[model samples]
Structures are given as C-alpha cells and as structure tokens.
Target chain A: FRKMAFPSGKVEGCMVQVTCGTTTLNGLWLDDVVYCPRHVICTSEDMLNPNYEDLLIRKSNHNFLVQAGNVQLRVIGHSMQNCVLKLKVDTANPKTPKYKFVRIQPGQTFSVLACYNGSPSGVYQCAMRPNFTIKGSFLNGSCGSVGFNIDYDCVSFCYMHHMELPTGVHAGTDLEGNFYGPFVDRQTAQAAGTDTTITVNVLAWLYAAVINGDRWFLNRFTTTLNDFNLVAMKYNYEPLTQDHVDILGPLSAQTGIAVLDMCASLKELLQNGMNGRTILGSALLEDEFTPFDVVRQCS
Target chain B: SGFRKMAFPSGKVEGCMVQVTCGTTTLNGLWLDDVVYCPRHVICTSEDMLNPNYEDLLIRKSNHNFLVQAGNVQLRVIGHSMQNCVLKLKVDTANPKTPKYKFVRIQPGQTFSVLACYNGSPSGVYQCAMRPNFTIKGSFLNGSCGSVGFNIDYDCVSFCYMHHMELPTGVHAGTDLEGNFYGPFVDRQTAQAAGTDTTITVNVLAWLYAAVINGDRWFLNRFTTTLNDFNLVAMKYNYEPLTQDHVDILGPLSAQTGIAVLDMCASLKELLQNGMNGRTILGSALLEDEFTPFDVVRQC
Candidate 1:
C-alpha cells in the first residue's frame, strides 16, 4: 500500500498508534470508524483521516506466496504494534525466486523480499493481522474474521475483482473510506439501441450494531435489502410502491429518530418519484453521503 | 442583569431556552455580545414527520466552540470571531414571518435577549439576527447598508481589526507618554486614577488610542488582514464597512463586561454602551440582510 507523504518527511499508513487513557493501542482506520483495540469506535466521518493506505497488516506470521511479475503487496506483523512497515522494489536480487512466502520476524525487525520477475521485483512480504500465537489462518486467499470480542476481534480483507457470496464474505470499509466489497449482484442500464447510458448499480448498505460494554446488540432487522440501500438511493430511483412503503413501515418503530427520519425521507422521495421524480454522486465519492450534524448541547 | 444556569426541559435535548421579562420596549438585536439568545417557543408548526424542518440549536463540542445548526439544517458560523467569542450569545431568531425577516429589534440600552427553539422542533431553521446597540436610533441601518454620509469615528484599520479579533477588547487600557489611560470604566475616579492625567477629560482621549491598539493587536499579530484583505472578505460576503462613529461608540464594550470608566463620560458611553466590535456588528448585519421565506401565511 502506498503511504501518504505528510508535509514532514515521515510516511503514514493504514495503522496508527493511539493513546486511550493510559494504555497504548493500535488504531486502525476502517473508513470513518477508528477501531481501537480497547475503545468503542465512533461512526462519524469527522473522527479520523481517511487518506492512509488501503491494506491492513495481518496479525498472522505466515508469509505470502507472491508470483513473480505480480506487483502485489502484503504485510505481516509480530504484534499489533510492530509490522513490516515498508514496501519497495528489490533491485539487488533481480533473480529472486517466485511462489515463495516471505517473513519478517522479531529478530529481523525489517526485511526486503525481492518480488521481481519481468516488470520489477522488490520484496514480497506477507501481511498479518498481528497476533502472537498463530500464523495466517486465511488459506485459499480468502479474508476472515477472528471472532467479535474486543481482544481478538478483527476483520481481514483480500483484494478481489468480484464478490463471492458462497464464501459468506461481506463488504468492509477501507482506510480511505472506500468499500472493499464482497459486494454481490449487479444491474446495468443501457441506452435504447446505444451504450451512451451505460451505468451499473450494486447493493450497498449502512448497518448499525450496538456494542454496549461487551455484549453486542445487532439490529436484527438490518438485512432487508430495500431498508438500507434504497434509502441511500433516494434521488436516483422511482417512487416506491405500496409494497415498498409497507416494507419500510416497520422500521419507523424499530429504529430511532435518525434512522426513522431517513426512512421517512426515502418514502417522500419515492412518493415524489412516483408522482414526477428525480436523481445525485462526490471523491472519496464526494457528496454521496449527506452529513448529519450531531448536536452538542448549549449548556 | 440576572445570572442563572438552566438546563433544557429534556436533558437529552442539548440547550435551554431563556426567558426575559423586559418591558415591551422595542430595541434592536444585541443578543450575542450582551444578553442570552433565548430559544423561542413555536406558536405552531406542521405535524408532518418529514417537513424538511430542523430545530435551530446551538452546539458546543467537548473541544470545539459554539456552532449553530439552523433548520435546513447545517452548522454555519455567522460571525467572524473565534469559536469562544461572546458573539454566539446574540444569535436570536427572527419570528417566522416575511417583511420582518431582516434585523431583530430590541429596546435601546435595556436588557434584551434572543430566543432558542426546542431540541427537536419540526420547523425550518429560523432566521437569526444581531441587535447592535447603535448610538443613533437608526444609524446602524445606514452604517451596515452603505452610508458614506453617516460618518462616525471609525478608521478602516481599527474597524477591521475589531471585526477579526479572537476576543474583542471591550475596555481600553494602556500607559502612554502623557498619562496612564484606561476606561469604559465604572466611574471618573477610576478613569482618573488609571489615566493619571490631571483630569478625566485627557484620559478619555488617551483611552481611544489605547482601544485602537487593543483592537489592532489581534489583527497585527495573528490575522494581519490588510485593508484590502478586509475589503476582499467584506466583498466576498457582501459586507459593507462599518462607519467610524459606529466603531468608536461600540468598540470598548465588545468584550464580555459592560463595566468601564468611560461609561462615566455619559455622552460617549450612551452612544457606545450598546456597541459591539466591527466583526460582530457586520455579521449581524449580514444575518439581518439574509431574506428567509416562510412556508405558512401570516396576518399582515
């Protein structure tokens, strides 16, 4: 992953060290949320900078099998705090063999593995989720999660072109506020007899799961397809029929004001669309998301 | 004149609406610098769940300054002052009516306040305005709306400085070659002692220069916006320069306190007693200038 070159000569990446109270913990920027090992993360986009690297270093010790001529990169960590921090071309060993897994252990704080074939070979280092006891568990190049508890809970993702629903993979937010989707299903719109109106649509959603203390209260009603993404696609679609209205009706009592308001607005847009209708997109996918001003009391 | 800390009816709803029982004397808006900008009660609003209406409320984050999110709803700073400036207090909402969309009125030199609405009211962001206490009954109108003839005592340098200062310097204080000058003080004895001049008259003149420096320091050290720079900002926002008489009268009391020896100079104090810095005054002017439309019809 390319590190953001800060004004100072230092480079920053996917992970950061944060101090919560007296304990030092590794902070991962998964989109807007700052997932600290010891704290409840805030969902507001203003909480963290989303310009760092897209890849999260794995805690596992297993080296990655890199193919020569492939410019792929991964990071392995001895612990959450330490990892193979740099990636570059390995010019010295141009004939470095391919299909071999690379490792950076505690004794060797940093290592450069040659990843060259025909294009260019630098070090091919394996990325980890940072655990001390085990090596990589994600075989067959699939991303996995390590439970949901605070101590061991982590969501790992691997880059892929298409979603594999059978793998039971879901989308996760990248460090740059972009989605690393296990996104499934698609629809494309084509202009009549022409490709001028070529456009594609995919299912997306904003899920809410509350973790009060250690017990997580996941919103059981979140799986409804029309409930989440349809609301976000407010300005884009046609008026929702009564069936759609009925589908969204129950969310009003289930969700609180903020969610309820969104549902209502979605219905309004649907009504308008059905009557006459509309449309919207911004970088980080700008203006894609509307801001909700969290009120701070004037006490 | 009274000090009370009251929380809102519901604790979850941040901010409280303060009530003032000032006699029915019509005055201009001065809620920010001096009085509490109270949250007003809505006589009526639509019952629709999705009217695109939002509650007009003020927010102060743990580390941030007081910001306002009016219905429509978003956070926007109406003043040029810093987050912690006293100008936040004056943002009273205009009654949801046409014709009277601009400039709030209050009784002159009397206790006045603004009205803050409920936490989750279903109403459009109410248009809020500032109540500048002008020396002349209607001088502010001419000043804020481009009146070259309505000259007061303001210089462009000091005027812009006050507009951009982090904290407005209300009371003038500094020692000079002639004497020690300080004021907008409580009384003449205080001004005389601070001024160390033979008498109070010379001290008054001395404090003006002191107030200029006091007002200018923020501009010179931190902002350093030149006259042209100030003009660019003014032009960008369609803000007109505040006249001299306006600044000279209002500059001293722009700080938090209303106490000062210069108030003893009744003529000058009366003109300036209700005054505020150029930044706030101009900000109020802009808010007053904004024309907000009403959804419901009202009695003409």
Candidate 2:
C-alpha cells in the first residue's frame, strides 16, 4: 500500500462531546477518542432470529397451511410453549377451499392467517377471522396484545415496551424539586412492580440509543430469512456482519416483550426513585442524564 | 364471498371420459388402459398433480409460510397423465403461474410440453379442461387455431345410450326439435330379470307389422328411434346391429309417418259402407232407459 499524509495546515476540525453517568468532556479533537457503549453488545434481531429456536415457543415457527381446494386450515400448536405439538387434516371440499388463525411468538412478534369466502385463494369473501394469542409462563403470566391497524387480535410486534412484573432492578437517584438522590438496589427493584413508570425518553434510549450507540453495533444480528436489511438503518450506520450477530447467541432465550419488562423495571426504579414528581435529582429527566448526555458526561 | 360446492344436485356423474389434445398430439394411448378417463367434480391437489408446478404442491406441503384461501383452489382434477401427457394444469405461468404448472419441456421429448404456451390465456386449467389448447401449433386439426380455441366440450363424450338416423335432407331439428342436440342423453338399469316377461334386455326392437296391428302412427315413430338406439348399443358391444340400412332404421321411420295418412282413408271406407244402401232419417232422443238389462227390468 502506498503511504500518504494530509497537511496539518489545512485540516478540518469539529467539537466532539463525551460523557459518562454524570460527567462531561467537550471540545475534544476527532482523534484519540470515540463513542463506545461497553454494556451494549447485541441488537434485538440478534436475540430473536427465527432460526434461533431457543427463544421460540418450541416448534412455534410458521403461520399455517391451507388444504387443496382450500377448505381447512392446518397448524401444529397456536403458541407451543408446552413443547412438541400435534394436529391433523380431514375431508375438505369435493370440488374444493376456509380458515383463519392468529398467533404471537414467545419473542412477542405478532401476525395472522385469514380465509376469504369465494374462490378462497383470493383476498375476497373471507370466511373467518382470528385474534392473536399465546399461553405459557410468559411475562409474569401471559398477555401482551397491543392493538394494531387491522381487525381481529392485534399484537404490537416490535417488542420494546413490554415489562413483566417483579423483575429486580436498582435505581441510582440524584434529586427532585430542588432535590435529592435515593439509596436503593435489587431489593427495591422487586417493589418496582405494576405501577412502575419511566421517562418516555429513557424507554426510547433503551431501544434506539443502546443498540446503535457504539462499535458493538458493527456486528449486529441475523435471523434466518432476516438479514441486516431487517434492522432499521439509524443514520447510514456502518455496514455490520454475522460475527456481531453471534455475540448474542446466549441471549436468544431472553427475547420478546418480556425482555423489555426487565429494562422497564431497571429504569422505573431510577426515574421514579423519589416522590412521583421527579427523577434522579431533576424535576424532569431532561435535566439529568440523557443517554446522549450520559455519554458526554462520562466520556 | 360464498362458496358454491362442486357436487351437482345429484350430479358429479360417473363412468365418463373426455378427450384431450395438444394438436397432432392427443390423449389416445392413455385410454388404452384404465389410466385415463377423466372424472367430474374431482378436486386437484398438489399430490395428485403431476405437471410442472411442483412446489405449488410442496409449499402447500411446505413446512412454513402457508396463507390459506379456501374455494380459491378447490381444484377439480388432480392426477398425472401417463408421461408425455398434460393431465391438466401444466402451463408455464413461468409465463408464470409459478411453481404448479411452472416450467415444463425440452428437446427430443418436447411435443406437448410448453410454458405459457397458455396460462391465463383465454383462461388457465383450474382443475378443469383447457379451451385454450396450444397457442402455438404447427397446424390445427380443423381450421381452428390461435384465439380460435379448442373444444371446451370434450371431443369424445363417454356415454351408454346414443341415437342416430339418416334425416330427410334439409329436415332436422326445430320446434319439432332444434337439436343438433347431438349433445346429450342416456338412462338405463343394470337390474337382472327373467327373459319371458322381464327379460335381461339391452333393448327391445319393434316389428313393423306390430305398429300396423296397433294402427298407431305415434307408436310407430317411437319404434323407429328405439331400433336406432338398439343397433347402436348392440354395435358398441360388437354385437350385430339388427339392420344395416343406417336406413333400415330411417327407412322404416319415414314409412310410419307416411302411414299416418292412411287413417283418413279407413274412416272414409267405413262411412261409404253405411251410406247409399241404408235408410237414413233421424232426429231423436232416448225416451226409454236403454242402459238396463231387458229381462231384469221387465222390458217389453
């Protein structure tokens, strides 16, 4: 490779802010420092790749099958949390096509299969409709059907806002109305049940910021039919690879809206640390540390 | 939005076969064995299918992603042609309907095998026959070709009873009967019976003189047609047809119609027998009860 150097006299420079929990370093040059989220290792697609059956409700892979002449709908188990499921097909049409069913995966993804009335292969004249559902020991006990645009059962698919009850978490508070910080840990997290809440901004960061904030993202996740294309591009982020996806193989079982339940517990224990009116020393979360604010503060 | 079932009201009929052709190419050899003979109301599935689109079958059998639509595919016939055969549904929708009648044909074995050679052209073979024969043909049997269309009605319609007769030129079907009605009928029984009164009969033939004895011209017309059906059924089984005239049949039928005019002559002959030789004056009503037996009623 040929070597070349840029003239120092004509170099362009810009302010780069860096932070940690409550510290900040501004005005740094582009060299010698970069944003790096050490605790964030995998993107969600990583933990929920369709091929990674570890998080699936055991054999709960596809939607369903339609018989020839299109009469009956065939499926194994709606939400097979019980493991190996079984089913059958019987006499349908003499000349020939009816159906409809909806399901939610343990990963908390939602979709459905429907049947139209005439010439059934087409979208017209539907015969029946379905509501999405699943059962197993999910999220404290089951139930996370958020609404969607279509009729029937709508399962809000992008599983980031769900929270299971009693997931232990700790809050590191700083203040409230001209404020104060709280002293708490895992014990206090269990009490972070039902009514727990967090700043909407904190929820957003857990999803977008935590995943795209660092070099760890250069290696994201890949489900079977899903590729990097599956992940939403956040500012033309650098091209990533399967190597990054492998990092979360161990975390596959922890996927679904339930995973969000835990993140919710951790954030609520902190944001509502004081009286109902404040968060970590500020009346609003904005005054404290934004995920972006935390980066510059600690950097 | 609603489904119309395949079963006809007591119809879906049995013992039937239809003709299929791709051009100089046809389905003759298949009929040599029981292997061919199309059935009605038959529903075609991926398994029974043998043409091109394989996954159309596989995906239905497909382990994943199956969006079902009933009535959309209640395929009528699902079977394989004996090779070199397109049982139905093997057009290249690769023109493309995809995977089912997907890709077909190649070299030395390329007679009836073609793709999009017709798919939704005119219309596809959705569990039924294709009217839509070969879009590309070296030459057609009749002048029919291209958009001209193939026979939607089977060229050879299987049946048990058939009737035919030489018509008197120009005279055919109308209010008297407008049937090129070459089309269609046949009803019978397989019941076993005694020949004396209840013969195990394939049919009954009319002796011309019997109609003469009955002096019934309409009965005569029926006799003429029955004889034709009689000969046809007999010939089908390789039995000797009672008459060879194609005519012995028509010849007799026309004669009966001709004889209908005789009834008028007979009525005139009877009138003359009583005319000039007998007295004739009358204006009367029954003044006595004539219906009663004379002795029993003490008649004088």
Candidate 3:
C-alpha cells in the first residue's frame, strides 16, 4: 500500500509508496494511486489468496480517516485475467455508515472525492475476490488463504487561487484591468474602459468558432508540451472590446474556469500538456459535460 | 500622160513613194513611180495573181530616195501553193553606214507583211495579184485585220480513215484542222486542243448517245421485272456539265459487250439503277473517306 498528499498552497508534489504483504506473490503489483492534502481512506484493495491458483475465499476490506477540502487518492491492483474489485466509502464515523459500491476490472484504477460543500472527513475501503486452487485440491474444501490491506490518512487542500481571465489579453489597455473589477457589472465594466480584457475572451471565442468542428481540442489534450504550445499560439492574441467578454464568458463558464486558464495553461501547457496521465486528468475536468469514463474507454 | 520611166537607182525602193500619175493617163499610159500604198488602201487578191511579185514592182519608183524606217509588224500565213515570193525589209538604217535588211521566204499559202514609215508616215500592206498564176495568191489591206482576212475551213475530208477504225459500233471519227482522225481510243490531243480536256470523252459520249437511241425496249424485255426501273426519266434533267456521275452511269455498259444477253440486261439495269447514282449520292454526302460508311448505311 502507498499514500500521498495533494501539496499545500503554492507547493506541488507527490508522496508515493507501495507495500508488499508476506506471500509468494506470482503477479501482484501496484497499478496506480490517488491521494490528496488530507488523510482519506477513499479506497484500498487486497487478495485473500495472493497466488490466484483458484477462486476461493476472495474477500478484502479497509478503513481510514478523511478530512475535507479537496482530497485526492490513487488506486493500485493487479489481476491474472480480470476479477471483480469493489470499493465502499463512509464519512459517517463507524456508528452509521453511508456507502456506495463501484466495480473495477483488471488493469483499471479510479479515484473518487466529494467537491464544493460536503462532510468534512470520511474513510473508505475496497475489497477484491481471491483465487484458491494453489494449495492442492481440498478434500473438504480447505485452502490456505491470505489477505492484503492499506491505510490512508486523507486530507484536503485549499482551492487553487490563481485567477484567470479569458485567454487573449493584450498589454497597454484598461479593458483587461476592468475584467479584474473596479466596475459594477459587465456592461458598466465594459463602459468603464476600452474593454481590452475582452481580447482574451475574443481569442477564446475565435478558438471555439474555428475549432468547433475539428478535433483540435482532443488532439491538443493528447499532444506533448512542445506541440501544445505550438498549436495553442495559433489563436493566441488579446481582446479589444466587451464583445469579446460575451465571446469567452460562456465558454469559460462551461469549462468551469475562466477561459484565460484554459488559454494560459494551453499557452504555458502545464495542465493536460505532456504526460498522458496529466492530459487525462485535465481532460476529465475540462470536459465534465462528457461521460466521466470517456478517457478510460478511449484508452 | 506619157511613158514616164522612173528608175530605181538600186532596183529597190529605199522607202515609201506615192504614184501621183501614170503616163498622163493616155498613150504611153500613166506609169506610176515606185508607189507604196498605205495599209488602208492596199488590195487583197483572192487567187494567185500574175507577176507573182507586185511587192518588187513598187520598188522601182524612187531612185534610192525612198528611205523608210521599219516599225512594228507581224506576218502570218494560211492555205497552200503559195511558196513563191521573197520579201526584203530594212531595219535600223538611220546611220546608213550600217544598213540591215531582213529577208523572209513565203511558203505555199503563206502570207507576210512588213510595217514601215515614210518620214514618220506608216505604210503597212502586201501587194496582192503579184504571182505568176494570175490567181490572188495573197491579200492584204489593213486598218485592223478583221475576220475577213482569216479563213476557217471546217471540211471533214481533212481526217483520214482510222486504219483499224475501232470506233465501237455507232461511234465515228471527228476531224480536226491538222487532218487527223480520232474517236474510239480517245484523241487526247484533239480533245485537249478542242478545250474539252475536263469533259467526258468520245467513248463516254457514244455510250450516252447509244443509251438514248436504244430506248428502254431492250431492258424491259430481257432482264427481271426490276429492269423496268432502269427506264430513263424525261423530266429529271441534269443542268451541270459532264461530271463523274455521268461517267459512272455510262462507263460500265460501254465495256460489257461480250456478256450474255441476260447478263447484259442485268448489267445495264444495275448500271442504271445503282452505279452512278449510288456513287454520286455517297460522294456528295461525305466530307472524307471516313465519312463514306455513314453515308452508305444511313438511309438503309
């Protein structure tokens, strides 16, 4: 078993660890893990018979604490063919528990966390079926069995604070400044200045317009750091009027962040930029309107 | 009028002289001097005349004083038996230091004339009735020599019998001016000379004429009932001259003499019904050889 925290404040790091229980393991290896800033027992898995010689006495369970904010966790497991792996979560301390079961197949891993307003803490446990034929045929069905477990202290981190405007923002203008406020409303803010902030929105609008029919977003999501920068710049520029605000407003809202974040992250290519895992993560966030398992199905 | 004898010192007229009087028109009758008449008053003889050389008689009037300058003239001869005279004319003698005389021989039936000017006055006429036969051998008087002076004899006797006159059946020889006969084998020469180079030949002509004369009686009685279609139409006239169409129709019949009477009937019918009209219709419609097939099968 392994544990990790979603780094605090401006710090970004990964605490990764794996444990091997006492057993002559044939094929049991860590696949992945999801962790956060707080201690959370989101899920864990174990095999009753690590050898998987036969299907017998396969059962697993785990329990741990969880804190609230934003919790991240990882899953790890292995299988010969595919075994039905299950998971359960409970934030209501041991007395009364609320739980949900999720099925996992071989070579697959997943993480779950509550966002926005939720119980401040919780624990989760996962169980997997075991194999039995390894200890010889039982005359009366007696077979040696083993169990594996992992514990996690789940915690939460504060919301990421880097504010983002719509993408295309050119220097030397008040409109960009107005987007950050000093205006009453969008119309007043627009009237208050030349609306340069709208430039960023305009850029995003143009991208949406031109790229609406193409698979450029998907392609960019999968591309490497060098390539993402190369492609994102193809539409990078600043806005000049409030019309651009209208252009990027809905797109950003739809994407669950300011369009600028998408443009900046796309421009700087830090999120969903290089590593496939990072790309998948950001893609999941950015494309929430799509099925949650879309990336998994594609992979 | 007395016998005035004007002598030509050189026995020749040096130039032109007028005969103003001839021995005063009395005994010793008027003897005209070397008088050369202008072309407008010259006389033309119908037969060989006496003296045979009147051109020489007019030469003795002037004693080497009849000097005349030679001018433009052309001499042409026609007829026969006129081979007796000689004409002498001077050329380029203005310097007298170098005189040149052009002498010409007149063959039988030949006529010759010379043009000269007496002190810028033109004298151009031949003296007729000047030969020994007393027949007008040559005649000439000219402002312009109109058709009167030239004769065209169209006597057919001029041609000879074709030694093997192979003129097929109804054809005969046509005589030409050179006394040659031609027909059957085509006198290419005469045909060309007669300005019929581009026309149908004698053989073709004979064929068409035979077709007209034979009538349709021969075709109607011999061949199949279809032969009746070979009859010539009275109203369908050909306005253009002899053309390939005419040749195609007439050519085959003309060459099929030895075949069976029935075969001849079929041939003649075929020729009339198909040959020329088929070829002509096809030829007229097509612009090139490749277009021929379309024309051939189109109406079919």
Off by over 4 Å in 3: A1-96, A102-265, A268-299, B1-300
Off by over 4 Å in 2: A1-107, A114-208, A213-299, B1-95, B98-300
lDDT of 2 by residue, B131-164 (tens): 1111121211111111111111122212211111
Q: Residue by residue across A1-299, what tens digits does model 3's lDDT show?
A: 01111111111111121112221111111113222211011112322213332322232222222222244222222222122121222322221112122222211112211111121111111111111001111111010111111112232221110111221111110111111122121111122223211124223432332332322433232223344435434544222233434545655454444443445544543334444333321222221111112211111
**Residue A55, candidate 3: alpha-carbon lDDT:** 26
Per-residue lDDT tens digits for candidate 1, residues B47-77, read 4212312232222222123333333333332
* TM-scores, one per candidate: 0.18, 0.14, 0.13
Query: Per-model C-alpha lDDT, please?
Result: 0.21, 0.21, 0.22
Question: For residues A193-269, could you state the per-residue lDDT of candidate 2 as single tens digits?
Answer: 22211232233223232333321111122233133223212212222234323432223233322223423332333
The order of the candidates by lDDT, greatest first, is 3, 1, 2
Q: What is the Å distance of residue A221 in model 3 from its true position?
A: 21
Candidate 1 has a DockQ of 0.01
Error of 2 at B88 (Å): 31
In angstroms, the error of model 2 at B39 is 48
